[model samples]
Target: YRLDDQIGFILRQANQRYAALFANGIGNGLTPTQWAALVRLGETGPCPQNQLGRLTAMDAATIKGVVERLDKRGLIQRSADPDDGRRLLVSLSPAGRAELEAGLAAAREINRQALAPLSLQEQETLRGLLARLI
Candidate 1:
């Protein structure tokens, strides 16, 4: 089969395009994973660190590093869970919220540009198919 006909090749190419789009659009220094984590925390308020990782589709080590970096930048805060002494909760700091708000418009524009090649219906279909695959 031709390389272009392979699913892996197609997916890789799409991901590379997305990475480029993200890098160009998200002018803030945050990586995609960090942005995802911040977005999740902003949406959910305080949540268990593990749950935050799961919500962002990140693994333990990746989430840990992301959290640590964000914490160091004063973008997020971590505190011991009151109900569960063994667990920690992650929440967005004020700086994180401001940054998320500032970046949201750019994020939306990036998405719009990325899907500009598809019609509205086609974009919806693609999203549904990708969601199922994920």
Candidate 2:
């Protein structure tokens, strides 16, 4: 079969396009996956670190590394749970929240341009189709 005819190839090409848009728009030096984790934490409001990742479609294994650099930068507040040394409580720092607010607006804009070719009806439909599989 032709490589371009494969389903994964199609998806990968779309992803490459978005990656370019993301880098240009969201300029916080955060990867999209890493950004997802922080957004989840902010949304949940001080959740268990593992549970934060759990809510964001990533594993603790992936989020753990994501958390470290951000944590070291003091972009997030990381505290051990009162009763469990092994469990970490994750929340955003003031700096992080400020950055998220600005970055999120850019993120909104990125979505607009990334799928600009798709009409609203199809944009919603396309996302729904992806969600169904997700």
Candidate 3:
């Protein structure tokens, strides 16, 4: 196979492996999208759903639905944006932070497994190269 094709194969396989491990770690209650939201919130702090969508590269409506589901699960909450009443600020609950920490740890472990064949220096170099591509 060509180099690009080999890279694609590895990426797809790694994604599938990650999904399987993440599902087991998170239980059946959470979806990948929800996990992503929690991560973004954890990284960026509270903000409007619209801004969350931009951060996650998700559509606005999808962000809205995910926020709603997370809110219903008691993992997050929405409040009026003091700066702009029309916009709502979304924040993670205590449960949400706990869930995110667990999920993040699981994700890191899965990623480490994916890079098991590489040395630490190779892994760092690979990450640096990939970051340049984006």
Candidate 4:
């Protein structure tokens, strides 16, 4: 199969796996979109709202909605950016961090399980190839 085909297959499978595991293991209180935002914040520290929108592949208005929802749930908050006082930085609350950590653990396990069919060497090879594309 071509690289595109392979990647498409992998991504589709990964999403399906995430959906199944996430839904069964955790309550559906958080949608995939919110989960994605949480995961990004969990990995990277406080970042500008615009940057967060870019990282999440969401538009500004959509990001505003997401942030509003997260903020209402006490999952995140906005603070003035130190570098750019005019820009607002978005960060996770204590509860949000804990929730994200749990979600990250679950995602890592899901990824590990998905790669079970591949040996360590194969996994490394795939990673190397993908990295070279960058």
**lDDT winner:** 1
- Tens digits of lDDT, candidate 4, 73-101: 89997789899787888999998988887
Question: Residues 3-94, candidate 2, lDDT per residue (tens digit)?
Answer: 98997998889889999998888888887877887787778877887787778777878888888877876789977888888887889999
Better of 3 and 4 by lDDT: 3
By lDDT rank, best first, the candidates go 1, 2, 3, 4
RMSD in order of candidates? 1.0, 1.6, 2.8, 3.8
The lDDT of model 2 is 0.84
Give the poorly placed runs of model 4, Cα more than 4 Å off. Answer: 1-14, 25-29, 131-134
Clash pairs detected, candidate 3 = none
lDDT of each: 0.90, 0.84, 0.81, 0.78
| Model 1 steric clash pairs | none
Better of 1 and 4 by TM-score: 1
> Which portions of model 2 miss their true places by more than 4 Å?
83-86
Stronger candidate by lDDT (1 vs 3): 1
Better of 1 and 2 by TM-score: 1
Q: Give the TM-score of candidate 2.
A: 0.89
Q: Which ten residues in a row have the lowest lDDT in candidate 2?
A: 49-58
lDDT of 2 at 10: 89
